[PDB]
Amino acid sequence: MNIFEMLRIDEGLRLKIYKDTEGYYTIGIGHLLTKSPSLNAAKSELDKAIGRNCNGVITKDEAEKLFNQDVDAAVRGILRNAKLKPVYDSLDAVRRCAAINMVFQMGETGVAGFTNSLRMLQQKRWDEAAVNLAKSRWYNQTPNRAKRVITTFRTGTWDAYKNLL
Numbered sequence: 607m608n609i610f611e612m613l614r615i616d617e618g619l620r621l622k623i624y625k626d627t628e629g630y631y632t633i634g635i636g637h638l639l640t641k642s643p644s645l646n647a648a649k650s651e652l653d654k655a656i657g658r659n660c661n662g663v664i665t666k667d668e669a670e671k672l673f674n675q676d677v678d679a680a681v682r683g684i685l686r687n688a689k690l691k692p693v694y695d696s697l698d699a700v701r702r703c704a705a706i707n708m709v710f711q712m713g714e715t716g717v718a719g720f721t722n723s724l725r726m727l728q729q730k731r732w733d734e735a736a737v738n739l740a741k742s743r744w745y746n747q748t749p750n751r752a753k754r755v756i757t758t759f760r761t762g763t764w765d766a767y768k769n770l771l
């Protein structure tokens with residue numbers, strides 16, 4: 607497994623504009639278009655992102671291109687963030703994928719909330735980190751995905767993702 611397979615499992619693939627778990631317009635593999643309630647605003651963002659008039663629908667190749675851009679952005683965001691970069695650099699490869707997954711889902715605005723978890727991950731206190739990570743709106747609102755990501759941090763293996771092919 608790799609970060610693309612992991613996030614494809616967690617986000618799915620949809621070629622028409624849809625609403626994500628928070629009710630925001632999204633397309634492809636978890637590509638957020640806008641937090642605006644306006645479908646027209648989402649359609650404009652989609653056209654700007656793809657570079658043609660899509661009328662709310664894209665091809666699989668286009669979805670995969672947004673996905674590559676979004677993964678690249680998540681990783682670069684971690685490397686630019688003074689609080690995240692040292693933790694990320696301290697981690698092994700599988701756990702780095704769990705970190706990318708979280709940033710892909712939630713962005714970086716709530717990093718301060720995860721200060722204690724980041725410290726436990728940096729210290730390699732995996733069971734304690736796992737317990738701390740679950741005390742979160744993130745876990746309570748998307749528990750099946752949070753559990754897979756947390757198990758990945760706890761074990762440093764892909765067991766939570768092989769399980770469910």
Ligand SMILES: CCCCCc1ccccc1
Pocket residue numbers: 684690691693694705706708709712713714715716717720724727
């Ligand atoms: C919003 C906070 C996400 C933090 C996820 C993470 C964990 C370890 C290293 C980098 C990023």
